[PDB]
Design a protein around this ligand. Structure first.
Ligand code: 5OJ
Ligand code: K
Ligand code: K
Ligand code: ZN
Length: 358
């Protein structure tokens, strides 16, 4: 079924910051990504998957009733009360349409996972906002209300079987604290994150993101953090992390579905990330993941704030999903010594759990 699905809905643009029309998490992130897909004739090659609202019962797969009800209630708030509610969270703005856009983003991803798991398509891309991976069971954080990726893994298990093996690869420049916590005790969902860490000083500013956090109880080994220290990283570092860590661990895990928390704020041009991963870089990461899970890959937009960088990067990913050949990747410099230390720290930490690690 060599078809690639694409899901996008303009209604997700309604979510906005009422006090700063220029806030980085712009409604125009998704519309510019979508337009580039059109221009490059990628959209027309895809099977268009309908967006939908997630239900409250689906939200409850990962989130508490209290958290759901609080975010639901913002739908009817006056502007000053929205400001106050948003200030109760770390790095959140809320509008009357926020709840609905968050529901659309999750339901769009559920329909995509269903299309893949029932064989209607091989793989899919979801152009959605607001993002999800900083969201926790009981709280909103870092522009995220509900954890779209976490929900989707659980949704997928719910329409297949409880023990469906799901891999979540999170290449957003920030650590997905919410995703790690939701599955920390879980051995059916393998969470792998690459992220700027700087010894805990980079958002979300927690030692939860370090390499030594390997999972808990039966989930021991099923949480893989690859923290970057010492400034700018690029294609050389990310390709080396995939070669030595991500792809060997993923092959041993043998996932049946791969979800990508695909933020593009590690891209060159992005002020919030400060890294230099190129669009060709992201193409190669995507292409490697396609060798897993009989090709069952869902790419889900997280962060990424340079409108041109994210449009070109995510388009490049969809092109790989569609079966185009990978672009030339420039002379991969020897790694920064810092990156080498990071990769060796993860290798040492995970040697007890993954026999295939050399
Ligand atoms: O999802 C994200 N990036 O993909 C993301 C999540 C959270 C942030 C916040 C964040 O990182 N910062 C600090 C920037 O140096 C911040 C800025 C202004 C006000 C409050 C905090 C930035 C990005
Ligand atoms: K990440
Ligand atoms: K896990
Ligand atoms: Zn991010």
């Amino acid at each position: 079924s060599p078809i690639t699905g694409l899901v996008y809905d303009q209604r997700m643009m309604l979510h906005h910051n009422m006090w700063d029309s220029h806030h980085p998490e712009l409604p125009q992130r998704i519309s510019r990504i979508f337009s580039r897909h059109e221009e490059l004739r990628l959209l027309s090659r895809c099977h268009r998957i309908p967006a939908r609202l997630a239900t409250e019962e689906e939200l409850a797969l990962c989130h508490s009733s209290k958290h759901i009800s609080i975010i639901k209630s913002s739908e009817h708030m006056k502007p000053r009360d929205l400001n106050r509610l948003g200030d109760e969270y770390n790095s959140i703005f809320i509008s009357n349409e926020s709840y609905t856009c968050a529901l659309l983003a999750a339901g769009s991803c559920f329909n995509s996972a269903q299309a893949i798991l029932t064989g209607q398509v091989r793989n899919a891309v979801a152009i959605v906002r607001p993002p999800g991976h900083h969201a926790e069971k009981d709280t909103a954080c870092g522009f995220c209300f509900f954890n779209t990726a976490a929900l989707t893994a659980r949704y997928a298990q719910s329409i297949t079987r409880e023990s469906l093996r799901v891999l979540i690869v999170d290449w957003d420049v920030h650590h997905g604290n919410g995703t790690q916590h939701i599955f920390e005790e879980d051995d059916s969902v393998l969470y792998i994150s690459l992220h700027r860490y700087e010894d805990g000083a980079f958002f979300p500013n927690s030692e939860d993101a370090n390499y030594d956090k390997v999972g808990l109880g039966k989930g021991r080994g099923y949480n893989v953090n690859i923290p970057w220290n010492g400034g700018k990283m690029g294609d050389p570092e990310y390709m080396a992390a995939f070669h030595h860590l991500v792809m060997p661990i993923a092959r041993e895990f043998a996932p049946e579905l791969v979800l990508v928390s695909a933020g593009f704020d590690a891209a060159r041009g992005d002020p919030l990330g400060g890294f230099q991963v190129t669009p060709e870089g992201y193409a190669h990461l995507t292409h490697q993941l396609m060798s897993l899970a009989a090709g069952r890959v869902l790419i889900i937009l997280e962060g990424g704030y340079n409108l041109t960088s994210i449009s070109e990067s995510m388009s490049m990913c969809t092109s790989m999903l569609l079966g185009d050949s990978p672009p030339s990747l420039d002379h991969l410099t020897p790694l920064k010594t810092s990156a080498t230390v990071s990769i060796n720290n993860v290798l040492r930490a995970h040697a007890p759990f993954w026999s295939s690690l050399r």
